[PDB]
Design a protein around this ligand. Structure first.
Ligand code: CLA
Ligand code: CLA
Ligand code: CLA
Ligand code: CLA
Ligand code: CLA
Ligand code: CLA
Ligand code: CLA
Ligand SMILES: CCCCCCCCCCCCCCCC(=O)OC[C@H](COP(=O)(O)OC[C@@H](O)CO)OC(=O)CCCCCCCCCCCCCCC
Ligand SMILES: CC1=C[C@H](O)CC(C)(C)[C@H]1/C=C/C(C)=C/C=C/C(C)=C/C=C/C=C(C)/C=C/C=C(C)/C=C/C1=C(C)C[C@H](O)CC1(C)C
Ligand SMILES: CC1=C(/C=C/C(C)=C/C=C/C(C)=C/C=C/C=C(C)/C=C/C=C(C)/C=C/C2=C(C)CCCC2(C)C)C(C)(C)CCC1
Ligand SMILES: CC1=C(/C=C/C(C)=C\C=C\C(C)=C\C=C\C=C(C)/C=C/C=C(C)/C=C/C2=C(C)CCCC2(C)C)C(C)(C)CCC1
Lengths: 42, 84, 742, 222
């Protein structure tokens, strides 16, 4: 079990999941704010 | 439709093939032919009831070849009617 | 004799190793002192023969790897069938396939890419496809999304099953040597078992399901009320209505009067005007005869019984005067070194892929295939690319065998010995032939272009000037067009329509095939192809023959297969390993394939493809300027390369706009490749050194010591990027142009 | 060992271990150089026993209903060929005391219980007589060999009185009847696939009219 944990902590899979989460966040932001060119908050 | 062209051809080809096997005129299971001559019989280890050592393989291979040669010599039926 | 001997449970399914990378390599398992470790890890993963010294373990490993590959292929097929089921317009396409664009991929409306889901007709929106599945799914009478759905499910099942089988056969029940090394029974089966029975069962599926439903659809019916397949075999009366003979059970076959079945098994030839495709009766007769042929072939070699040959008993007999002892012992070489088999099989597979690419376009098997232009074009060029890659791989692995596992003391041969004994003569004569062909096939183009730009057209190489006639090709075409007259009475027309005799097949105002004439331009392009092929053969054959030892370096083999050089000594010894020979030959194979596919595109769009008028006048897609503008490189720029690159470059703001974008990135990478191909290492090493200093100044110097890529990896990344750029460029060009105009 | 179409790879492992070895195996499957899982000779004897027994029961049962219907008193409500009973939808069906599909999965679960327990016994012999089973525990130990379980649950009347010879007879009888029932079942099914009228009616036919000889026709129809 702990072996599969140390394997999961190997940079490829960690990086893939991290990048997937980041891309999901970005595409969701783009969905909720289409075309988002300026900073119309301040 | 028995005894006609197909029947007589198939039976004579298969029976002559089996005789060539059993009498020493075919390179069957326990006979391997060289470049030329054939009579180089050597054993495989397939003892069966046949008095000349004919397993259930050569008695099937010779049959297959006889049926093939029969079908081939008959389906060149360009002189006995293209439809039978 | 031969038995079922295997072994039990060598390696346990324990995750102990997954957390320790490079367990296989002793050095790799120690730890990454630098950054080149993580390159070297991937670089030698699949290198099985450098992990042991006995063939049993590597044979087990490749047996499992084949299962992995098959699992991936099954998963891909499942994905394809699914996307056809749940995301296509396949039913609307079946309604009328004349002017409805096959689309099988939609895109999510998130980031403005809705335009990607362009207009494809039939009340659908989706990225148009060119894979050509739809002609197949109409040949096999799928005609219902339920069928695609259940087929995808079954494919997923088979994929998981194969993955299991893999795991089990490596871990639990590992095969032994006397099983693997036993090739007699393997040949016996694969000849008789796999291929033959395969074609036989397919002939079954065609004569009992496809043929009737396809004939009904050709008669013209909404596939909704078309009778289901199983309802064509359960109740006989339907097929009875179709084919009188077919209502006679099995008497006319067994009783040797086969001519009764003449209706659905025949030898018509030609194409079928209703769809331009092949007469499915013909293809059924083909598959069935091929099945019988493979079955009768499979019974060659003695396996356990007393009949049959032995692959050792066949070679040693052949021994001619000049060569001497003949092929004696070769059986041992091709049974004791995997790389040899990999090379042989890769070569034959590449050649077969190429010949499939060729035979496809000239004899469209599927229905409504020779009228979906982009599909035909894309299929042909894809098969060509795959064949080229397979051939290069064959040469590379042949070289690897030559280096490592060749040895005269025990793996002796007297044929290969002679071959190697006079390598210099072979390479010299091939080199001279390469020079000769290069001159007399490219300098001709140069002369023609120059004498054009100098206002002397009547001193050109064409039909209207000093004339070169491909007489042998026209001779063969005449023979093939007059052969169905006497030599092959059982046929009806020529074997294909591309032979120089007959009429044209056109469906839906568009033409599919017609006679093909050969002009001097064809002579020149054929000689260009011959030259480029000869040069690629020169490169790769020189690499293989000189992988052991050259007259420059005496003991090259000892230095190993893949090493960068032998230092700058003796005037410089860069790129002497066979690996670098393959690195070189890759570019030339790319060039050969590129010019071949360009020639194909131009010839088709200038002499075959196009539209047909109501009266019957043909106006080809490009106007038929081949025989007058393929004979000048400046022409190739003007008439073909520049002109037919319009549709990709105006493609912005339309459905095809994606094909536009790649047309730049393809070029870009293409650039990028040079950065790796031209530079060296020491420069980058010093630059990395200064960067490491700049970081270390901030207490950021990573323990994974940075290192500029090793030389061989630099060349590898360069050649990969270059091939990617070139192939992606031609891909975008082709798709955009053909799918826009056609 | 009445030799009928033997070979040498047969005699490599068929040394007479199975009750009544006749010596008939051209192919030579269970050669013990590497013992293939489920190709074990023990497993082979087990398989022939089990298959032949199932075939005996099936050849009795599939033919029972319609046959009995002939001059008997099982009603014509089930006067239907076994291959038309409903197991073959392209032939016939019937309205039962449940629906078709759930019935099938239910009987599958029951047979699965039985055969899973039997297999677990096969791996570890006798090991069923340990766990709680709501009774039945003091019977399922068997007679040692999973081939032959014995036990008053499966030995009610009491045979092989004080003997192994009587067991050898009874048992040869077992193998012979299993093989004969296998042949009869396969033949009934082949007639059914090619004749299309039903076995017992085929007897009704072949009692009087000799001229039938339907190998001459070879008519292949549903
Ligand atoms: C000895 C008698 C005999 C005769 C008169 C023929 C005659 C013929 N055979 Mg034939 N054949 C024979 C024996 C014979 N065969 C045997 C023994 C075999 C192998 C079992 C074959 C296998 C064979 C094939 C596979 C084919 C022929 C075909 C033909 C026909 C054309 C052959 C050709 O070149 O033109 C011709 C009518 C061809 C055909 O289409 O027949 C009409 C064809 O394709 N033959
Ligand atoms: C077609 C794809 C494919 C296939 C079938 C294999 C097959 C294999 N690889 Mg592999 N590999 C591939 C592509 C592939 N590789 C690619 C593209 C890379 C990147 C360069 C690697 C990098 C790689 C490394 C680094 C290692 C392997 C290893 C292995 C072997 C054991 C892997 C295993 O059991 O995982 C089973 C996984 C699952 C059942 C599911 C996991 C999800 C096996 C022969 C190992 C090996 O051979 O070591 C001796 C090993 O250490 N592979
Ligand atoms: C089914 C065919 C097949 C098989 C089984 C193999 C198997 C193998 N090849 Mg090979 N090869 C093939 C086709 C094949 N190749 C073809 C078609 C070519 C020509 C392009 C080559 C060219 C080639 C070279 C030049 C070399 C090998 C090497 C190897 C061995 C190590 C693999 C490796 O390092 O890659 C590990 C996996 C990767 C590096 C992943 C790369 C992914 C690509 C580059 C990204 C782009 C894809 C889009 C391995 C035994 C190497 C070897 O033996 O080293 C000593 C070696 O030097 N092969
Ligand atoms: C499920 C089918 C099946 C299986 C697995 C076996 C299995 C076996 N048979 Mg067998 N056999 C079967 C059906 C089967 N038999 C039938 C239907 C017949 C009647 C023709 C026979 C007649 C038969 C003979 C005559 C012999 C075998 C023998 C053997 C051996 C091996 C255990 C050999 C034996 O005696 O066992 C060791 C042997 O010589 N079989
Ligand atoms: C392995 C043995 C076997 C198997 C699988 C079958 C299978 C079947 N029998 Mg059956 N049968 C057998 C032996 C077998 N028979 C024997 C030996 C006899 C003689 C006593 C019969 C007498 C018999 C009759 C009289 C009837 C069946 C019926 C049936 C069918 C419905 C089952 C049923 O009634 O549910 C079991 C019901 C429960 C309430 C429990 C089914 C095809 C019925 C049918 O439709 O006829 C084909 C029916 O009416 N069987
Ligand atoms: C009809 C021929 C026949 C003769 C025997 C003979 C025997 N069987 Mg038997 N059996 C048969 C058919 C036959 N079986 C069929 C068709 C199924 C079974 C299922 C069966 C079981 C489940 C058991 C026997 C047992 C026995 C033995 C008491 C004896 C050797 C018993 C045994 O093996 O005793 C050791 C036992 O428990 N038989
Ligand atoms: C087990 C013994 C057995 C018996 C008594 C019969 C008896 C009969 N068979 Mg039969 N048959 C058997 C085994 C048997 N078959 C086997 C093992 C096969 C498979 C090859 C066949 C295949 C078969 C066919 C294909 C046909 C018969 C037919 C017949 C009938 C003539 C007759 C009632 C014929 C028929 O239609 O019966 C009504 C017929 O055409 N049999
Ligand atoms: C025609 O070749 C036929 C000729 C016949 O050689 P042998 O009869 O000695 O070879 C027997 C063959 O089975 C090959 O082992 O082949 C050679 O002599 C080898 C040199 C070919 C020279 C080719 C020159 C180009
Ligand atoms: C010996 C030898 C030797 C050499 O080496 C080789 C060779 C020659 C190959 C071999 C041979 C073999 C053989 C012959 C075998 C046979 C088998 C069988 C027949 C089985 C069955 C088996 C069979 C079986 C299981 C079956 C069973 C059945 C049953 C229960 C039934 C049921 C049913 C019924 C009631 C009715 C309904 O409605 C339906 C159903 C559901 C249908
Ligand atoms: C005298 C005597 C004897 C003998 C007898 C005889 C003479 C028998 C015969 C037998 C036989 C007579 C056998 C046979 C066999 C055959 C076979 C086995 C065949 C097969 C065939 C096939 C398989 C076919 C195929 C095909 C098809 C299907 C189609 C396509 C083409 C072809 C042709 C390829 C005995 C032993 C009794 C005893 C002692 C005395
Ligand atoms: C956003 C981002 C960025 C940027 C980026 C860029 C700028 C990119 C570029 C790029 C470029 C400038 C170019 C590219 C290109 C690409 C490509 C080019 C790809 C391809 C792929 C593939 C996959 C292909 C494939 C294929 C073909 C088509 C051919 C052969 C066959 C196959 C299928 C293989 C930054 C940094 C700001 C940040 C991060 C993120």
């Amino acid at each position: 079990m702990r072996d599969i944990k140390t394997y999961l902590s190997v940079a490829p899979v960690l990086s893939t999941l991290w990048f997937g989460a980041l891309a999901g966040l970005l595409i969701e932001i783009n969905r909720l704010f289409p075309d988002a060119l300026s900073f119309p908050f301040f | 439709y028995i005894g006609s062209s197909t029947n007589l051809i198939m039976v004579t080809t298969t029976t002559l093939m089996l005789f060539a096997g059993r009498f020493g005129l075919a390179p069957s299971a326990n006979r391997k032919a060289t470049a030329g001559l054939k009579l180089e019989a050597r054993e495989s280890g397939l003892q069966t009831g046949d008095p000349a050592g004919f397993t259930l393989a050569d008695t099937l291979a010779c049959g297959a070849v006889g049926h093939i040669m029969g079908v081939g010599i008959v389906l060149g039926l360009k002189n006995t009617g293209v439809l039978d | 004799e031969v038995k079922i001997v295997v072994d039990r449970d060598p390696v346990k399914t324990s995750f102990e190793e997954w957390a320790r990378p490079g367990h296989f390599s002793r050095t790799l398992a120690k730890g990454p002192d630098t950054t080149t470790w993580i390159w070297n890890l991937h670089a030698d993963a699949h290198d099985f023969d450098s992990h042991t010294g006995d063939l049993e373990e590597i044979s087990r490993k490749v047996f499992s790897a084949h299962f992995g590959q098959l699992s991936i292929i099954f998963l891909w097929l499942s994905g394809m069938y699914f996307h056809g089921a749940r995301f296509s317009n396949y039913e609307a396409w079946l309604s009328d396939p004349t002017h409805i664009g096959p689309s099988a991929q939609v895109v999510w409306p998130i980031v403005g890419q809705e335009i990607l889901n362009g207009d494809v007709g039939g009340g659908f929106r989706g990225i148009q496809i060119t894979s050509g599945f739809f002609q197949l799914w109409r040949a096999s009478g799928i005609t219902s999304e339920l069928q695609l759905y259940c087929t995808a499910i079954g494919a997923l099942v088979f994929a998981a099953l194969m993955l299991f089988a893999g795991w089990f056969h490596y871990h639990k029940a590992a095969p032994k040597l006397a099983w693997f090394q036993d090739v007699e029974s393997m040949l016996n089966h694969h000849l008789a078992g796999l291929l033959g029975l395969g074609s036989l069962s397919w002939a079954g599926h065609q004569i009992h399901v496809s043929l009737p439903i396809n004939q009904f659809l050709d008669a013209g019916v909404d596939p909704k009320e078309i009778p289901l397949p199983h309802e064509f075999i359960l109740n006989r009366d339907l097929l009875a209505q179709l084919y009188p003979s077919f209502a006679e059970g099995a008497t006319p076959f067994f009783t040797l009067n086969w001519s009764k079945y003449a209706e659905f098994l025949t030898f018509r030839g030609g194409l079928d005007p209703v769809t331009g495709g092949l007469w499915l009766t013909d293809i059924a007769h083909h598959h069935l005869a091929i099945a019988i042929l493979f079955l009768i072939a499979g019974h060659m070699y003695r396996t356990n019984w007393g009949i049959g040959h032995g692959l050792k008993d066949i070679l040693e007999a052949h021994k001619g005067p000049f060569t001497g002892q003949g092929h004696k012992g070769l059986y041992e070489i091709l049974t004791t070194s995997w790389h040899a088999q990999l090379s042989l099989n890769l070569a034959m597979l590449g050649s077969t892929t190429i010949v499939v690419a060729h035979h496809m376009y000239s004899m469209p098997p599927y229905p409504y295939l020779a009228t979906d232009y982009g599909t035909q074009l894309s299929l042909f060029t894809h098969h060509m690319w795959i064949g080229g890659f397979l051939i290069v791989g064959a040469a590379a692995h042949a070289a690897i065998f030559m280096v490592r596992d060749y040895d005269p003391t025990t793996r002796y041969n007297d044929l290969l010995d002679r071959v190697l004994r006079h390598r210099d003569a072979i390479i010299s004569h091939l080199n001279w032939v390469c020079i000769f062909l290069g001159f007399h096939s490219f300098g001709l183009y140069i002369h023609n272009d120059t004498m054009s730009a100098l206002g002397r057209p009547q001193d050109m190489f064409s039909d209207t000037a000093i004339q070169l006639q491909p007489i042998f090709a026209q001779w063969v075409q005449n023979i093939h067009a007059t052969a169905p007259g006497v030599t092959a009475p059982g046929a009806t027309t020529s074997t294909s329509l591309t032979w120089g005799g007959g009429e044209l097949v056109a469906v839906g105002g568009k033409v599919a095939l017609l006679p093909i004439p050969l002009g001097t331009a064809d002579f020149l392009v054929h000689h260009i192809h011959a030259f480029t092929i000869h040069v690629t053969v020169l490169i790769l054959l020189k690499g293989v023959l000189f992988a052991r030892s050259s007259r420059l370096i005496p003991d090259k083999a000892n230095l190993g297969f893949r090493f960068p050089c032998d230092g700058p000594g003796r005037g410089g010894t860069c790129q002497v390993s066979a690996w670098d020979h393959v690195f070189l030959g890759l570019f030339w194979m790319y060039n050969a394939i590129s010019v071949v596919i360009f020639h194909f595109s131009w010839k088709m769009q200038s002499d075959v493809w196009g539209t047909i008028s109501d009266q019957g006048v043909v106006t080809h897609i490009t106007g038929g300027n081949f025989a007058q503008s393929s004979i000048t490189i400046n022409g190739w720029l003007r008439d073909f390369l520049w002109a037919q690159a319009s549709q990709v470059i105006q493609s912005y703001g339309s459905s095809l706009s994606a094909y536009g974008l790649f047309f730049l990135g393809a070029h870009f990478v293409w650039a990028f490749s040079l950065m790796f191909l031209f530079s060296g290492r020491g420069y980058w090493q010093e630059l990395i050194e200064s960067i490491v200093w700049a970081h270390n100044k901030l207490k950021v110097a990573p323990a994974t010591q940075p290192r500029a890529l090793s030389i061989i990896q630099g060349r590898a990344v360069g050649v990969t990027h270059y091939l990617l750029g070139g192939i992606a460029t031609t891909w975008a060009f082709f798709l955009a142009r053909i799918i826009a105009v056609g | 060992r009445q030799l009928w179409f033997a070979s040498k790879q047969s005699l490599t492992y068929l040394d007479g271990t199975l009750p009544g070895d006749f010596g008939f195996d051209p192919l030579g499957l269970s050669d013990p150089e590497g013992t293939g899982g489920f190709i074990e000779p023990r497993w082979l004897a087990y398989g022939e026993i089990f298959n032949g027994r199932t075939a005996m029961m099936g050849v009795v049962g599939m033919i029972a209903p319609e046959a009995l219907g002939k001059v008997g008193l099982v009603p014509p409500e089930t006067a239907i060929p076994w291959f038309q009973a409903g197991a073959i939808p392209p032939a016939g069906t019937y309205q039962y005391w449940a629906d078709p599909y759930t019935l099938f999965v239910f009987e599958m679960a029951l047979i699965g219980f039985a055969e899973h327990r039997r297999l677990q016994d096969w791996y570890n012999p006798g090991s069923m007589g340990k766990q709680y089973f709501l009774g039945l525990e003091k019977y399922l130990g068997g007679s040692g060999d999973p081939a032959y379980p014995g036990g008053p649950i499966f030995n009610p009347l009491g045979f092989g009185t004080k003997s192994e010879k009587e067991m050898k007879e009874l048992k040869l009888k077992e193998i012979k009847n299993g093989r004969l029932a296998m042949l009869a079942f396969l033949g009934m099914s082949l007639q059914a696939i090619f004749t299309g009228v039903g076995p017992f009616q085929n007897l009704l036919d072949h009692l009087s009219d000799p001229v039938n000889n339907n190998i001459l026709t070879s008519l292949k129809f549903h």
